[PDB]
Amino acid sequence: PFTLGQRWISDTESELGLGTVVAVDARTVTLLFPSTGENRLYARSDSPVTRVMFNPGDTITSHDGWQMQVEEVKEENGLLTYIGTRLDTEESGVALREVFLDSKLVFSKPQDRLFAGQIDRMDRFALRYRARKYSSEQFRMPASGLRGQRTSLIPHQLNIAHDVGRRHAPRVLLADEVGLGKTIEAGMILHQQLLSGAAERVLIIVPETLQHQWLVEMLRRFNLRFALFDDERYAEAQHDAYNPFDTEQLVICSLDFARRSKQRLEHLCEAEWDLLVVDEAHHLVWSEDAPSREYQAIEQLAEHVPGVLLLTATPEQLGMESHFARLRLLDPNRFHDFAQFVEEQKNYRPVADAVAMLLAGNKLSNDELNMLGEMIGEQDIEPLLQAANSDSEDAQSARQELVSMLMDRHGASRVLFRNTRNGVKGAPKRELHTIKLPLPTQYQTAIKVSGIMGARKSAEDRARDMLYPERIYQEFEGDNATWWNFDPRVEWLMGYLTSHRSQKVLVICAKAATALQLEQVLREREGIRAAVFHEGMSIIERDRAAAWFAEEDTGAQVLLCSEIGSEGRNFQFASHMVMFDLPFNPDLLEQRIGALDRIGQAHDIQIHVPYLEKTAQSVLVRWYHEGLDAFEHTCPTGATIYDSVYNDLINYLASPDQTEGFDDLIKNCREQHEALKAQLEQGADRLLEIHSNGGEKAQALAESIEEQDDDTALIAFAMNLFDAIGINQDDRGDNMIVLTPSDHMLVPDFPGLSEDGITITFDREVALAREDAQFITWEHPLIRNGLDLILSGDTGSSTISLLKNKALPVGTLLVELIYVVEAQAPKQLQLNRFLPPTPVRMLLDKNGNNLAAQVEFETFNRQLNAVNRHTGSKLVNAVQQDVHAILQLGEAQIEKSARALIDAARNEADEKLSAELSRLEALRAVNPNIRDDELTAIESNRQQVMESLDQAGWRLDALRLIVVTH
Amino acid sequence: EFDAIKIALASPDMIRSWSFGEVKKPETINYRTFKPERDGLFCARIFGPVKDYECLCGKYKRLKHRGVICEKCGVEVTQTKVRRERMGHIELASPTAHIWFLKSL
Amino acid sequence: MIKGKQGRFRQNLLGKRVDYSGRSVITVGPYLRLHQCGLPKKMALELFKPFIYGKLELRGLATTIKAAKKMVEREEAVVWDILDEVIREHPVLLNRAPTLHRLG
Amino acid sequence: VKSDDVNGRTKMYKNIVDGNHQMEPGMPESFNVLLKEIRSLGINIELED
Amino acid sequence: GPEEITADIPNVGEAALSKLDESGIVYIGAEVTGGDILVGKVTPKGETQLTPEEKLLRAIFGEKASDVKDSSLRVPNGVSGTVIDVQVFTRDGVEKDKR
Ligand SMILES: Nc1ncnc2c1ncn2[C@@H]1O[C@H](COP(=O)(O)OP(=O)(O)O)[C@@H](O)[C@H]1O
């Protein structure tokens, strides 16, 4: 009966508004929702749509917005046209083609079921209402809930999750130091965006090793998978589709794979993602003189991804300019000149005192008020400042908004994010141990004559060459010379691991050949099994070695990793470390050490380093240990400290005979390091990490979310939903329950189940202990599938319930009405954060009086009990005409309520959009390098979203009859 | 719901009327992924979705866009059991005799 | 596919292992009327099992179905009563081996 | 409904546990399988009234 | 992988494991009944399923403590009995377990 021009409503997707029948085919039909503007190709079979009916005497509105009174309908060629009397002008005989109706539906009321003899049982209404109540809040919950992860709650972790995961097109620099957990936080962001629906298509580019770790971790904890596109997958996706990548949703792809060909980069660019994830962003080689091909490729990616996540473990190893370049990628308007960030930090050195005083509740001197005004470049300051300064009635939130503005002109404290370990509780310990050994004379003979032409190498290059005395010895005495026979290091480490035969150790050297030969020695001589990580090992081999070393129960006793082997693999089980060759530059050794300094350590990390006497190793050890103490501590200030004494340091190293005047240099370096640390802790930072952890207020917020996760309502609701489905449940006892299909399942096959069954636990900590079982939540896919199934299960709603009140008059009728307040717009306008489909509960007696707010649904629910079927429906519907009247009261009593519900999210959108515009304009006025058309466009979008949100409506979704017996 | 049964020689238009689309490529799976190669012998858009209420592209998920032909991968969203009945057809380059009527004996 | 024993023409004729079946050795039954067949307990709690589930969950003795299953497998005294109720009038078909007659 | 019809089997089980004694009128799916088998061959094998 | 005769079985109550031995074999003279496990046997959860992401998992190895389906041999339904003897037979090159 389909025909061109008809208007239909989707059954499951009531949120798209009215759909226009664009075209029909023999077996297919192309519809269009103009309110969403989205075209959908449905199969003619299976009818996933409905033709909502405006009965005669109803009221309709054309797309121009003028209402009418339908009085007749005619059908020709399976196409319906309406005739009615207008309501604005009361002109009769006005005909309308249904194509010219509104694009958004405010109708399809279900009372016709009651007036046509169709009704259901009581167990089809309460579940619907509670599911609606839980689901609507997801789009304005505390970040739709953020408990759907297999993570041990940490303050800054959840603070970052809540902050980033509720922001459109986020772009930040996650630069928490090594091992604190940035993959977990980023997974929180990704899962939050996915659950909210704000993001669906994402990119993830990581180093070669991190791909498998990320994939397995996200699937195991966030239940997220991102397909990996190697050469073969990319090639066959080409050989089928025009655009290979876009078939999938979430992707893993190495930048190595990405930059292979320009057209491949273009294909990646034109895939229209939402979020971009880049791991170890320090590798991005920016240079105003000559940016790298990889760097500009990732720049194109940034240009064509609304969302970006910069994850770097070494924000400052490449000096200050790379950090500024990364921020410029995040915000070119803010970070336009490199010479301004340093002045910003110097100016913010004392400024934390202002916020400290403000948070104390005391008054702020007007002199300091016209310095807070100086920091923030706006002139609307006084209205907010006076309200917050006197601790006005809006102060609880006005102060929060004021400090948000201060952040905004501080740098937002959002493009940057750091977490230390000194003030951040949870660092077990980092003990250091040093061992000195005699330098064998063979390397002395080699190095004495090593310098003939080697002066061509620079001092940096001379130190790099000295990094492998074994390899220079091979070069002098033929390749693969027996260097490992006269090594006191070999004997020392043999004894060390003899002490630790019953324990696992991570040994790390500088290159692949070193790892190969050392493993050869250990396996052939002492029979000690050691899992290597040399570059000759493919990623599969790397995974195999990681697995064998991870089998603490009878696994590899030693993990030999080359320089590249110091990747983000989780070796928290390994609590001991060995530094073989004592790497030259600091931050590489910092990353190596952080390879173990993660969560889940069996005990504190103790590090061992054998160094031969009278060599560059001793100088580097002394300098790092005393001048900066960069080993035991994690003070991130080495970027320019290394540069300052760079030339003298490399001269000393390349000329070990030069030793005069070294202690004073060490002392001055320590003076600089401690002065810089004092400057940083006083201000320009150490409040940024406070924002990252959000303080004890954020801790209490996280605790509230955790208590919400501890809620036991989901367990009962999901268990009874499974029982209705027919899923066999068997409990083991340790908070583990196995669900399996049964002979009496409502569907032959369900998405999230198999014949083998699956174990689940509702507890966070047990799930952490037991990675087997899934962590079931409202965020888990199974519960989402069931919730959507019940919501789309339009069958139900109507009920026949009995209430046993001996002291209430017999025959009293109470109608429970569940309406839905909905708005229509594209997903890319993210109305979820502003207005989702929202339930509205009303309780009407015979005279249409409200009792919903006087008694809650749950306490009411215990009293109800369904009574006999259709005989009951007829007996009670003997007076069903009154229901038609009741609506005219109930609507009249809830329509106003809908208005009260409509008036709310307008502030939510307006305030945040105006704040973002204010920051944009304040930054733009300082820097005349912005396109005014873009801000005109976002102002137009502000008007668009405001006006659209001003449009709304409420529809009826469920109705329940209740009769009180005695 | 079925009165007497009728059997007759099938017209080519009848055969093409017993299909949603035509197969045009002999292929089974990726051998890397589960890729049902386009116009493959198990083509998703000619027969149905490999997994219930899904699109091969993975855009829609398990009930929401039910009975929707994914605009990208061109596949209905219905149960995998729909794959059991959706017939296909191979257009012959040249007319080819049917052996059964040749050798009814 | 249209030929041989697996031919889908002669398929519903070969023989189907029907569910709700049974068997036993036979024993005389005086004290029975002429329309009663003494059926064992151990076989009448595995024939009318789903009927027992229905009349059990409906009565509310164990609303959830898995509880009803675990109750019947627990031989709880109530299940005998429910089974008696369901088999109150629920004719069974007794079929001898070679069914020449139509009385068989 | 007691030999091969999986959908019929499940539906009948639902009706029995739900307290409704009723088969589902409709041609067994074996007919549909045979019909598609014949249609594999160039044979109309259509239905009638 | 091989089939495991360990007493460890998922989706089984403590009642079943009460009479078994640690190895997974019932003790002599155990008055078994219908449904009790005589031998605790399990299989390694089907085969290669899901998607090439599943092959990725196999490359990384799964993350299941159980990682084994239940295939224990129980008493046939409807027979009591008192176990007399339980013989064990081993292929050469298989180290004999506790039972
Ligand atoms: N909340 C948490 N719960 C469990 N494990 C965690 C948590 N946070 C971090 N980890 C562990 O720390 C490891 C390192 O995290 P990742 O962010 O990938 O690298 P890094 O922390 O060094 O940047 C991960 O493998 C993860 O297992």
Ligand SMILES: [Zn+2]
């Ligand atoms: Zn699709």
